[model samples]
Target: MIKIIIVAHGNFPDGILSSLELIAGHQEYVVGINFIAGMSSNDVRVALQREVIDFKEILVLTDLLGGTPFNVSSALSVEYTDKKIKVLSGLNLSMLMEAVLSRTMFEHVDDLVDKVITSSHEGIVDFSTC
Candidate 1:
């Protein structure tokens, strides 16, 4: 089974999930961990740990590369996981949708990462470049 968790400052993660589900339908494999304004890295890590406890393999996506959510998730994947986990940053609704879609699509945790990365990049458009 493949599982995914999204972590970001405030409702960033939640907003992606909300937008994703509106188009893709309900998701159980994907969830969001909101890093509120005052929360520390430990808080984010703990919350992630709880959500991830049941899954043996997971994809953890964060809002920004160097942000606390990414830092905490990277640390947790390194320190606590005996399971398979990959942390990807710079999230978007397209990324979330691909992650959820991967459950039935090309369907491998690693493939899911690459797919989401591709989806995220493809999601960006510049009218001037067109």
Candidate 2:
């Protein structure tokens, strides 16, 4: 299974999960990362390691592209790049949920990432502003 980590500046993951459970009923295979103030580097390491240690594949999604959460996780991605751990930025509810639901289809990290990215980007819609 592809383990996905969702990190953000605030309680993004929790809020996402809360809303998901409220609307979609319930789900499994969803993990979250919320960066609090004064959080230690070791804390991030521990969380990331713990989240992905059990699973063979991992995909980390952070809120911002160049923020602290993303930067910290990006470093870990380099070390874990060879281990099928991929980190991505600008996570949305759809992308994360897709990752959770589509874990059974893709075998390779590249394919998984590709599918997520494709689906995520294509899921956008420009509503009729009438």
Candidate 3:
């Protein structure tokens, strides 16, 4: 099975998880990490490491591209290149929810990433253009 980790600044990760639980119910193989103020990248890294276990593939979701969460997760991805981990930044409720749902369906990392990207785009709409 694939594991998912969502890391964000402050309580963003927790808030996203709360929404996910409300919408999709409880999910397995998913975790959320909060990188609050005064915390270093290593702090987030340790929290992430603690959550990961015997999963062949892991999808890491971060709030921003160049932020601490993404940077630390990217660093870990490179460090554990053989672990088949993928990091997707700029996370929203749609992306997180999609990742949670797809983790049980797709065994391949690429397929999971595709589902997240598609859902992320689908979540954004312009009502003004309608």
Candidate 4:
């Protein structure tokens, strides 16, 4: 199974995790990294590198595309080019939820990430469109 990391500004990372736990109970191999004040991008990157060494496959979800968290995670992806790591931006509650619930069924991270993205996008709908 792929280890999941939620990186976001402020408390968004933890908030989303809390929401997921409320809806689906506690999850294993999942963590939230909050880019709070006083924490530098380098700090986050270093911490990520150390944390991921134990996991064979990891999926990093960031709050936004160009934000500090996403940028840091993206850079880490490049560093671990030969490793099974994926940095997905524009994360939402549904996205993380899908990852937690669906990862076990996927043998490859490529297919898992694709399904998570699809499920997340499908969850987005205007009030009248539904």
Candidate 5:
């Protein structure tokens, strides 16, 4: 099974996780890490490392493209390539939901990432006539 870690600046991760739980019901093998403003890269790294060590395969979702959360997790993915870790940025509810729900179906990491990206893209729409 693929483990998931959602990281974001401030409490965004926690807030979203709460919403996800309410909407999708309880999910396993998933965690959220909030990057409190004062925390350094090493601080985040250490915390992530501790949580990450238990999983053989992981998918890290971060809030923004080039933010600290993304950077730290990206680095960690490289640091643990043997563990089959993948880091994806621009995390949103649909992407996370897809990740959580479809994780077991996809046997390969690439397929899982592709499905999550596709789900995330499909979730964005201009509801009104534009």
Candidate 6:
């Protein structure tokens, strides 16, 4: 199973989940890292440990690429790079949901990550078909 970990500055992780829950539906598999909210360094470490414990592949999504939250995630992933843990930034509800759903369809982490990157990039596109 692939796990989704959200780490972002401020209350973004929880805030995005709340908004997505209201707009879409309930999500039971989504986990996050709201460091700027109320989570400590230990809290973040524990959450990440739990996430990678059972799941072989982990995809960490953050609000921005070079922000504090992303930096933390990047640092953690460095410790577990040999274990197939991936850290990707620039996240939104749309791409995250797609990645969560895509895990069920893909057979490997590469496929899942590819889908996530593609979906995330495509999701931000501006198009007018008129």
lDDT per residue for candidate 2 within 1-130, as digits (tens), equals 6677787877887887787788666666567878878787668777887787667777888888998778888887777545787778878777776776777798766688877887778777678742
Which portions of model 1 show Cα errors greater than 4 Å? Answer: none
The predicted structure with the larger lDDT, 2 or 6, is 2
Candidate 4 regions off by >4 Å?
Answer: none
Which candidate leads the pack in TM-score?
4
TM-score of 5: 0.93
Determine the C-alpha RMSD for candidate 5 after optimal superposition of all C-alphas: 1.4
Provide the TM-score for each candidate, comma-separated: 0.90, 0.84, 0.92, 0.94, 0.93, 0.79
lDDT of 6 at 16: 84
Question: What residue pairs are clashing in model 4?
Answer: none
| Two-way lDDT contest, 1 vs 4, winner | 4
Candidate 1 lDDT (Cα, whole model)?
A: 0.83
Model 5, 14-92: lDDT tens digits are 9999999899888888898999989898888988898888777788999999999999998888776568788999898
TM-score of 1: 0.90
Q: Is candidate 4 or candidate 6 better by TM-score?
A: 4
Better of 1 and 2 by TM-score: 1
lDDT tens digits, residues 1-130, model 6? 6667888777788898887678767765578677775667667777677777766667788888887667777887867645666788889766787876777886556678877888888777566732
Candidate 3 residue lDDT tens string, 89-120 = 87988898788777778877767999898999
Question: What residue runs in model 6 are displaced by over 4 Å at the alpha carbon?
Answer: 37-43, 127-130
- lDDT of each residue in 7-100, candidate 1, tens digit only: 9999887788878778977877788899998888898978998988888778998999999999989888876536778899988877778777
Give per-residue lDDT, candidate 3, residue 112.
90
Q: Which ten residues in a row have the lowest lDDT in candidate 2?
A: 121-130
Output candidate 3 Cα RMSD: 1.3
